[PDB]
PDB file of all heavy atoms in Angstrom:
ATOM      1  N   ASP O   1       0.831  -1.203   0.000  1.00 51.98           N
ATOM      2  CA  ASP O   1       0.000   0.000   0.000  1.00 51.98           C
ATOM      3  C   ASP O   1       0.870   1.260   0.000  1.00 51.98           C
ATOM      4  O   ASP O   1       0.685   2.180   0.800  1.00 51.98           O
ATOM      5  CB  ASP O   1      -0.976  -0.008   1.180  1.00 51.98           C
ATOM      6  CG  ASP O   1      -2.292   0.697   0.861  1.00 51.98           C
ATOM      7  OD1 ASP O   1      -2.529   1.064  -0.321  1.00 51.98           O
ATOM      8  OD2 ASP O   1      -3.088   0.883   1.810  1.00 51.98           O
ATOM      9  N   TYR O   2       1.841   1.281  -0.917  1.00 53.01           N
ATOM     10  CA  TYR O   2       2.666   2.464  -1.139  1.00 53.01           C
ATOM     11  C   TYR O   2       1.812   3.702  -1.377  1.00 53.01           C
ATOM     12  O   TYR O   2       2.083   4.772  -0.815  1.00 53.01           O
ATOM     13  CB  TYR O   2       3.589   2.204  -2.331  1.00 53.01           C
ATOM     14  CG  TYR O   2       4.522   3.328  -2.720  1.00 53.01           C
ATOM     15  CD1 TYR O   2       5.851   3.312  -2.320  1.00 53.01           C
ATOM     16  CD2 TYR O   2       4.091   4.376  -3.530  1.00 53.01           C
ATOM     17  CE1 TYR O   2       6.720   4.319  -2.687  1.00 53.01           C
ATOM     18  CE2 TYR O   2       4.951   5.396  -3.901  1.00 53.01           C
ATOM     19  CZ  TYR O   2       6.266   5.359  -3.478  1.00 53.01           C
ATOM     20  OH  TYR O   2       7.137   6.360  -3.839  1.00 53.01           O
ATOM     21  N   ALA O   3       0.766   3.566  -2.201  1.00 52.46           N
ATOM     22  CA  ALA O   3      -0.064   4.709  -2.559  1.00 52.46           C
ATOM     23  C   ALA O   3      -0.693   5.342  -1.328  1.00 52.46           C
ATOM     24  O   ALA O   3      -0.766   6.570  -1.226  1.00 52.46           O
ATOM     25  CB  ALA O   3      -1.142   4.286  -3.555  1.00 52.46           C
ATOM     26  N   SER O   4      -1.133   4.521  -0.371  1.00 51.30           N
ATOM     27  CA  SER O   4      -1.774   5.067   0.822  1.00 51.30           C
ATOM     28  C   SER O   4      -0.784   5.807   1.712  1.00 51.30           C
ATOM     29  O   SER O   4      -1.107   6.878   2.238  1.00 51.30           O
ATOM     30  CB  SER O   4      -2.466   3.960   1.607  1.00 51.30           C
ATOM     31  OG  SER O   4      -3.601   3.505   0.909  1.00 51.30           O
ATOM     32  N   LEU O   5       0.413   5.248   1.918  1.00 51.07           N
ATOM     33  CA  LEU O   5       1.409   5.934   2.736  1.00 51.07           C
ATOM     34  C   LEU O   5       1.807   7.255   2.095  1.00 51.07           C
ATOM     35  O   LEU O   5       1.888   8.292   2.768  1.00 51.07           O
ATOM     36  CB  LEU O   5       2.634   5.045   2.943  1.00 51.07           C
ATOM     37  CG  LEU O   5       3.715   5.618   3.868  1.00 51.07           C
ATOM     38  CD1 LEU O   5       3.139   5.880   5.255  1.00 51.07           C
ATOM     39  CD2 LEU O   5       4.939   4.708   3.948  1.00 51.07           C
ATOM     40  N   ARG O   6       2.058   7.231   0.782  1.00 49.60           N
ATOM     41  CA  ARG O   6       2.377   8.456   0.058  1.00 49.60           C
ATOM     42  C   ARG O   6       1.265   9.486   0.209  1.00 49.60           C
ATOM     43  O   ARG O   6       1.532  10.671   0.449  1.00 49.60           O
ATOM     44  CB  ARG O   6       2.616   8.134  -1.413  1.00 49.60           C
ATOM     45  CG  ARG O   6       2.898   9.332  -2.293  1.00 49.60           C
ATOM     46  CD  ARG O   6       3.136   8.847  -3.706  1.00 49.60           C
ATOM     47  NE  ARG O   6       3.409   9.924  -4.651  1.00 49.60           N
ATOM     48  CZ  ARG O   6       2.478  10.658  -5.246  1.00 49.60           C
ATOM     49  NH1 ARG O   6       1.191  10.454  -4.993  1.00 49.60           N
ATOM     50  NH2 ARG O   6       2.841  11.604  -6.094  1.00 49.60           N
ATOM     51  N   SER O   7       0.012   9.046   0.092  1.00 54.22           N
ATOM     52  CA  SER O   7      -1.117   9.959   0.201  1.00 54.22           C
ATOM     53  C   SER O   7      -1.209  10.566   1.598  1.00 54.22           C
ATOM     54  O   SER O   7      -1.396  11.777   1.743  1.00 54.22           O
ATOM     55  CB  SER O   7      -2.410   9.223  -0.161  1.00 54.22           C
ATOM     56  OG  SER O   7      -3.549   9.969   0.221  1.00 54.22           O
ATOM     57  N   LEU O   8      -1.085   9.742   2.641  1.00 55.33           N
ATOM     58  CA  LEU O   8      -1.288  10.263   3.991  1.00 55.33           C
ATOM     59  C   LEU O   8      -0.131  11.161   4.417  1.00 55.33           C
ATOM     60  O   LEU O   8      -0.341  12.158   5.123  1.00 55.33           O
ATOM     61  CB  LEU O   8      -1.507   9.123   4.990  1.00 55.33           C
ATOM     62  CG  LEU O   8      -0.368   8.298   5.592  1.00 55.33           C
ATOM     63  CD1 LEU O   8       0.242   8.969   6.827  1.00 55.33           C
ATOM     64  CD2 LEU O   8      -0.907   6.922   5.962  1.00 55.33           C
ATOM     65  N   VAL O   9       1.095  10.844   3.991  1.00 55.05           N
ATOM     66  CA  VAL O   9       2.197  11.755   4.283  1.00 55.05           C
ATOM     67  C   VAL O   9       2.019  13.066   3.523  1.00 55.05           C
ATOM     68  O   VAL O   9       2.169  14.154   4.097  1.00 55.05           O
ATOM     69  CB  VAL O   9       3.559  11.100   3.979  1.00 55.05           C
ATOM     70  CG1 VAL O   9       4.668  12.121   4.133  1.00 55.05           C
ATOM     71  CG2 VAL O   9       3.807   9.929   4.917  1.00 55.05           C
ATOM     72  N   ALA O  10       1.675  12.993   2.231  1.00 55.72           N
ATOM     73  CA  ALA O  10       1.475  14.206   1.445  1.00 55.72           C
ATOM     74  C   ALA O  10       0.374  15.076   2.034  1.00 55.72           C
ATOM     75  O   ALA O  10       0.497  16.306   2.070  1.00 55.72           O
ATOM     76  CB  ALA O  10       1.147  13.839   0.002  1.00 55.72           C
ATOM     77  N   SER O  11      -0.709  14.454   2.500  1.00 53.95           N
ATOM     78  CA  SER O  11      -1.804  15.203   3.100  1.00 53.95           C
ATOM     79  C   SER O  11      -1.400  15.799   4.440  1.00 53.95           C
ATOM     80  O   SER O  11      -1.869  16.886   4.798  1.00 53.95           O
ATOM     81  CB  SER O  11      -3.025  14.294   3.255  1.00 53.95           C
ATOM     82  OG  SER O  11      -4.045  14.921   4.008  1.00 53.95           O
ATOM     83  N   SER O  12      -0.534  15.110   5.189  1.00 50.26           N
ATOM     84  CA  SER O  12      -0.052  15.652   6.457  1.00 50.26           C
ATOM     85  C   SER O  12       0.790  16.910   6.244  1.00 50.26           C
ATOM     86  O   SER O  12       0.736  17.844   7.051  1.00 50.26           O
ATOM     87  CB  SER O  12       0.742  14.583   7.206  1.00 50.26           C
ATOM     88  OG  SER O  12       1.098  15.020   8.505  1.00 50.26           O
ATOM     89  N   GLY O  13       1.583  16.950   5.177  1.00 49.27           N
ATOM     90  CA  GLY O  13       2.301  18.157   4.828  1.00 49.27           C
ATOM     91  C   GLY O  13       3.597  18.399   5.566  1.00 49.27           C
ATOM     92  O   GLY O  13       4.183  19.477   5.411  1.00 49.27           O
ATOM     93  N   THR O  14       4.075  17.440   6.354  1.00 51.99           N
ATOM     94  CA  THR O  14       5.319  17.642   7.078  1.00 51.99           C
ATOM     95  C   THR O  14       6.061  16.321   7.219  1.00 51.99           C
ATOM     96  O   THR O  14       5.452  15.253   7.323  1.00 51.99           O
ATOM     97  CB  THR O  14       5.086  18.252   8.466  1.00 51.99           C
ATOM     98  OG1 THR O  14       6.344  18.426   9.117  1.00 51.99           O
ATOM     99  CG2 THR O  14       4.213  17.341   9.328  1.00 51.99           C
ATOM    100  N   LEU O  15       7.390  16.417   7.228  1.00 55.32           N
ATOM    101  CA  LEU O  15       8.275  15.312   7.569  1.00 55.32           C
ATOM    102  C   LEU O  15       8.870  15.491   8.962  1.00 55.32           C
ATOM    103  O   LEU O  15       9.886  14.869   9.288  1.00 55.32           O
ATOM    104  CB  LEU O  15       9.381  15.169   6.520  1.00 55.32           C
ATOM    105  CG  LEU O  15       8.969  14.585   5.164  1.00 55.32           C
ATOM    106  CD1 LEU O  15      10.134  14.533   4.186  1.00 55.32           C
ATOM    107  CD2 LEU O  15       8.368  13.196   5.344  1.00 55.32           C
ATOM    108  N   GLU O  16       8.255  16.348   9.774  1.00 55.14           N
ATOM    109  CA  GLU O  16       8.660  16.594  11.153  1.00 55.14           C
ATOM    110  C   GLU O  16       8.832  15.287  11.918  1.00 55.14           C
ATOM    111  O   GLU O  16       7.863  14.555  12.142  1.00 55.14           O
ATOM    112  CB  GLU O  16       7.603  17.472  11.820  1.00 55.14           C
ATOM    113  CG  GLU O  16       7.872  17.855  13.257  1.00 55.14           C
ATOM    114  CD  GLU O  16       6.802  18.790  13.793  1.00 55.14           C
ATOM    115  OE1 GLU O  16       5.968  19.261  12.985  1.00 55.14           O
ATOM    116  OE2 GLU O  16       6.787  19.044  15.016  1.00 55.14           O
ATOM    117  N   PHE O  17      10.067  15.006  12.331  1.00 52.20           N
ATOM    118  CA  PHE O  17      10.417  13.750  12.979  1.00 52.20           C
ATOM    119  C   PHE O  17      10.928  14.007  14.391  1.00 52.20           C
ATOM    120  O   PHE O  17      11.798  14.859  14.602  1.00 52.20           O
ATOM    121  CB  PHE O  17      11.475  12.999  12.165  1.00 52.20           C
ATOM    122  CG  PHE O  17      11.733  11.609  12.651  1.00 52.20           C
ATOM    123  CD1 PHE O  17      10.878  10.573  12.300  1.00 52.20           C
ATOM    124  CD2 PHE O  17      12.817  11.334  13.468  1.00 52.20           C
ATOM    125  CE1 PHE O  17      11.104   9.285  12.745  1.00 52.20           C
ATOM    126  CE2 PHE O  17      13.052  10.042  13.919  1.00 52.20           C
ATOM    127  CZ  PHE O  17      12.193   9.018  13.556  1.00 52.20           C
ATOM    128  N   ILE O  18      10.385  13.271  15.354  1.00 53.98           N
ATOM    129  CA  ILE O  18      10.808  13.343  16.745  1.00 53.98           C
ATOM    130  C   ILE O  18      11.428  12.004  17.118  1.00 53.98           C
ATOM    131  O   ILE O  18      10.757  10.965  17.078  1.00 53.98           O
ATOM    132  CB  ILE O  18       9.647  13.697  17.683  1.00 53.98           C
ATOM    133  CG1 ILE O  18       9.133  15.113  17.391  1.00 53.98           C
ATOM    134  CG2 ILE O  18      10.088  13.561  19.135  1.00 53.98           C
ATOM    135  CD1 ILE O  18       8.150  15.195  16.252  1.00 53.98           C
ATOM    136  N   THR O  19      12.706  12.037  17.480  1.00 53.83           N
ATOM    137  CA  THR O  19      13.399  10.840  17.921  1.00 53.83           C
ATOM    138  C   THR O  19      12.934  10.452  19.319  1.00 53.83           C
ATOM    139  O   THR O  19      12.706  11.305  20.180  1.00 53.83           O
ATOM    140  CB  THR O  19      14.912  11.068  17.915  1.00 53.83           C
ATOM    141  OG1 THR O  19      15.344  11.392  16.589  1.00 53.83           O
ATOM    142  CG2 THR O  19      15.651   9.817  18.383  1.00 53.83           C
ATOM    143  N   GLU O  20      12.751   9.154  19.524  1.00 52.59           N
ATOM    144  CA  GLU O  20      12.375   8.611  20.814  1.00 52.59           C
ATOM    145  C   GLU O  20      13.427   7.606  21.262  1.00 52.59           C
ATOM    146  O   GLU O  20      14.075   6.946  20.444  1.00 52.59           O
ATOM    147  CB  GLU O  20      10.985   7.967  20.756  1.00 52.59           C
ATOM    148  CG  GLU O  20       9.858   8.985  20.679  1.00 52.59           C
ATOM    149  CD  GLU O  20       8.492   8.339  20.544  1.00 52.59           C
ATOM    150  OE1 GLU O  20       8.371   7.361  19.777  1.00 52.59           O
ATOM    151  OE2 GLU O  20       7.539   8.804  21.208  1.00 52.59           O
ATOM    152  N   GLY O  21      13.623   7.529  22.574  1.00 51.42           N
ATOM    153  CA  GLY O  21      14.632   6.655  23.131  1.00 51.42           C
ATOM    154  C   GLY O  21      14.177   5.215  23.243  1.00 51.42           C
ATOM    155  O   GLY O  21      13.857   4.739  24.337  1.00 51.42           O
ATOM    156  N   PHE O  22      14.131   4.512  22.117  1.00 49.24           N
ATOM    157  CA  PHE O  22      13.863   3.084  22.158  1.00 49.24           C
ATOM    158  C   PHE O  22      15.070   2.366  22.746  1.00 49.24           C
ATOM    159  O   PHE O  22      16.218   2.693  22.433  1.00 49.24           O
ATOM    160  CB  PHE O  22      13.569   2.548  20.756  1.00 49.24           C
ATOM    161  CG  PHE O  22      12.199   2.888  20.248  1.00 49.24           C
ATOM    162  CD1 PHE O  22      11.997   3.997  19.445  1.00 49.24           C
ATOM    163  CD2 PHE O  22      11.111   2.089  20.569  1.00 49.24           C
ATOM    164  CE1 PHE O  22      10.731   4.310  18.978  1.00 49.24           C
ATOM    165  CE2 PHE O  22       9.843   2.393  20.104  1.00 49.24           C
ATOM    166  CZ  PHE O  22       9.650   3.503  19.308  1.00 49.24           C
ATOM    167  N   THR O  23      14.809   1.392  23.612  1.00 51.05           N
ATOM    168  CA  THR O  23      15.859   0.567  24.196  1.00 51.05           C
ATOM    169  C   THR O  23      15.820  -0.800  23.525  1.00 51.05           C
ATOM    170  O   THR O  23      14.822  -1.520  23.632  1.00 51.05           O
ATOM    171  CB  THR O  23      15.691   0.438  25.709  1.00 51.05           C
ATOM    172  OG1 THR O  23      15.606   1.742  26.295  1.00 51.05           O
ATOM    173  CG2 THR O  23      16.888  -0.285  26.302  1.00 51.05           C
ATOM    174  N   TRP O  24      16.895  -1.143  22.818  1.00 54.01           N
ATOM    175  CA  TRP O  24      16.991  -2.408  22.092  1.00 54.01           C
ATOM    176  C   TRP O  24      18.009  -3.290  22.809  1.00 54.01           C
ATOM    177  O   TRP O  24      19.182  -3.368  22.433  1.00 54.01           O
ATOM    178  CB  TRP O  24      17.368  -2.165  20.632  1.00 54.01           C
ATOM    179  CG  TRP O  24      16.434  -1.227  19.945  1.00 54.01           C
ATOM    180  CD1 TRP O  24      16.709   0.040  19.516  1.00 54.01           C
ATOM    181  CD2 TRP O  24      15.061  -1.471  19.631  1.00 54.01           C
ATOM    182  NE1 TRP O  24      15.592   0.594  18.940  1.00 54.01           N
ATOM    183  CE2 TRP O  24      14.566  -0.312  18.998  1.00 54.01           C
ATOM    184  CE3 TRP O  24      14.202  -2.559  19.814  1.00 54.01           C
ATOM    185  CZ2 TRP O  24      13.249  -0.210  18.548  1.00 54.01           C
ATOM    186  CZ3 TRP O  24      12.895  -2.458  19.365  1.00 54.01           C
ATOM    187  CH2 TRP O  24      12.431  -1.291  18.739  1.00 54.01           C
ATOM    188  N   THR O  25      17.542  -3.954  23.864  1.00 53.71           N
ATOM    189  CA  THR O  25      18.415  -4.755  24.711  1.00 53.71           C
ATOM    190  C   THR O  25      18.796  -6.062  24.025  1.00 53.71           C
ATOM    191  O   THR O  25      17.928  -6.831  23.599  1.00 53.71           O
ATOM    192  CB  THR O  25      17.734  -5.039  26.047  1.00 53.71           C
ATOM    193  OG1 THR O  25      17.446  -3.801  26.703  1.00 53.71           O
ATOM    194  CG2 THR O  25      18.639  -5.872  26.937  1.00 53.71           C
ATOM    195  N   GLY O  26      20.095  -6.313  23.919  1.00 56.23           N
ATOM    196  CA  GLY O  26      20.564  -7.603  23.462  1.00 56.23           C
ATOM    197  C   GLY O  26      20.757  -7.741  21.971  1.00 56.23           C
ATOM    198  O   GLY O  26      20.973  -8.862  21.497  1.00 56.23           O
ATOM    199  N   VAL O  27      20.644  -6.653  21.209  1.00 54.83           N
ATOM    200  CA  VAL O  27      20.832  -6.691  19.767  1.00 54.83           C
ATOM    201  C   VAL O  27      21.846  -5.623  19.393  1.00 54.83           C
ATOM    202  O   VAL O  27      22.083  -4.673  20.140  1.00 54.83           O
ATOM    203  CB  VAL O  27      19.512  -6.482  18.982  1.00 54.83           C
ATOM    204  CG1 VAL O  27      18.546  -7.634  19.231  1.00 54.83           C
ATOM    205  CG2 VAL O  27      18.876  -5.142  19.326  1.00 54.83           C
ATOM    206  N   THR O  28      22.459  -5.801  18.224  1.00 49.73           N
ATOM    207  CA  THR O  28      23.337  -4.788  17.651  1.00 49.73           C
ATOM    208  C   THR O  28      22.501  -3.773  16.876  1.00 49.73           C
ATOM    209  O   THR O  28      21.654  -4.152  16.059  1.00 49.73           O
ATOM    210  CB  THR O  28      24.367  -5.435  16.722  1.00 49.73           C
ATOM    211  OG1 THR O  28      25.020  -6.514  17.401  1.00 49.73           O
ATOM    212  CG2 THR O  28      25.405  -4.416  16.271  1.00 49.73           C
ATOM    213  N   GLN O  29      22.743  -2.488  17.118  1.00 55.68           N
ATOM    214  CA  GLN O  29      21.978  -1.433  16.470  1.00 55.68           C
ATOM    215  C   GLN O  29      22.745  -0.840  15.293  1.00 55.68           C
ATOM    216  O   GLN O  29      23.931  -1.107  15.084  1.00 55.68           O
ATOM    217  CB  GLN O  29      21.613  -0.323  17.464  1.00 55.68           C
ATOM    218  CG  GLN O  29      20.790  -0.773  18.662  1.00 55.68           C
ATOM    219  CD  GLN O  29      20.251   0.398  19.478  1.00 55.68           C
ATOM    220  OE1 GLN O  29      20.040   1.489  18.952  1.00 55.68           O
ATOM    221  NE2 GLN O  29      20.024   0.169  20.768  1.00 55.68           N
ATOM    222  N   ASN O  30      22.026  -0.045  14.502  1.00 56.99           N
ATOM    223  CA  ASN O  30      22.618   0.825  13.484  1.00 56.99           C
ATOM    224  C   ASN O  30      23.341   0.033  12.397  1.00 56.99           C
ATOM    225  O   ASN O  30      24.412   0.425  11.931  1.00 56.99           O
ATOM    226  CB  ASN O  30      23.550   1.857  14.122  1.00 56.99           C
ATOM    227  CG  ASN O  30      22.887   2.603  15.271  1.00 56.99           C
ATOM    228  OD1 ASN O  30      21.905   3.321  15.078  1.00 56.99           O
ATOM    229  ND2 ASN O  30      23.421   2.429  16.478  1.00 56.99           N
ATOM    230  N   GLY O  31      22.737  -1.074  11.968  1.00 54.64           N
ATOM    231  CA  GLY O  31      23.288  -1.818  10.850  1.00 54.64           C
ATOM    232  C   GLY O  31      23.295  -0.996   9.573  1.00 54.64           C
ATOM    233  O   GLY O  31      22.417  -0.161   9.342  1.00 54.64           O
ATOM    234  N   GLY O  32      24.314  -1.239   8.738  1.00 57.91           N
ATOM    235  CA  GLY O  32      24.486  -0.494   7.510  1.00 57.91           C
ATOM    236  C   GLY O  32      24.738  -1.410   6.322  1.00 57.91           C
ATOM    237  O   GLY O  32      24.899  -2.621   6.465  1.00 57.91           O
ATOM    238  N   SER O  33      24.771  -0.800   5.139  1.00 56.95           N
ATOM    239  CA  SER O  33      24.932  -1.532   3.892  1.00 56.95           C
ATOM    240  C   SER O  33      25.613  -0.644   2.863  1.00 56.95           C
ATOM    241  O   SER O  33      25.416   0.574   2.843  1.00 56.95           O
ATOM    242  CB  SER O  33      23.591  -2.014   3.331  1.00 56.95           C
ATOM    243  OG  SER O  33      23.728  -2.366   1.961  1.00 56.95           O
ATOM    244  N   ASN O  34      26.355  -1.261   1.978  1.00 58.47           N
ATOM    245  CA  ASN O  34      26.993  -0.536   0.948  1.00 58.47           C
ATOM    246  C   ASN O  34      26.053  -0.167  -0.177  1.00 58.47           C
ATOM    247  O   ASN O  34      26.355   0.639  -1.001  1.00 58.47           O
ATOM    248  CB  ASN O  34      28.252  -1.236   0.528  1.00 58.47           C
ATOM    249  CG  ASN O  34      29.406  -0.890   1.432  1.00 58.47           C
ATOM    250  OD1 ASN O  34      29.807   0.229   1.514  1.00 58.47           O
ATOM    251  ND2 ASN O  34      29.895  -1.845   2.147  1.00 58.47           N
ATOM    252  N   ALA O  35      24.918  -0.821  -0.247  1.00 55.51           N
ATOM    253  CA  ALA O  35      23.888  -0.374  -1.172  1.00 55.51           C
ATOM    254  C   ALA O  35      23.292   0.965  -0.757  1.00 55.51           C
ATOM    255  O   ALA O  35      22.515   1.545  -1.524  1.00 55.51           O
ATOM    256  CB  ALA O  35      22.785  -1.427  -1.278  1.00 55.51           C
ATOM    257  N   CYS O  36      23.644   1.468   0.427  1.00 53.83           N
ATOM    258  CA  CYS O  36      23.076   2.688   0.969  1.00 53.83           C
ATOM    259  C   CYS O  36      24.173   3.527   1.628  1.00 53.83           C
ATOM    260  O   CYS O  36      24.165   3.788   2.828  1.00 53.83           O
ATOM    261  CB  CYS O  36      21.967   2.358   1.963  1.00 53.83           C
ATOM    262  SG  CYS O  36      21.074   3.803   2.538  1.00 53.83           S
TER     263      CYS O  36
END
């Protein structure tokens, strides 16, 4: 449902992002890739 996410973000009118302190116990975070 790409079309729906695109529509609802476009209608919202902002990419305003608030970071939250998620705690990820026992896993490695911030994985990366050379494709990105």
Side-chain angles (χ1 to χ4, degrees):
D1 212 8
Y2 180 100
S4 289
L5 184 60
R6 177 179 180 277
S7 167
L8 80 85
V9 173
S11 171
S12 187
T14 180
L15 286 178
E16 181 177 351
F17 189 81
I18 295 83
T19 300
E20 287 177 318
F22 284 95
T23 306
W24 305 111
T25 300
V27 295
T28 309
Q29 301 190 27
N30 309 296
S33 163
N34 277 297
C36 187

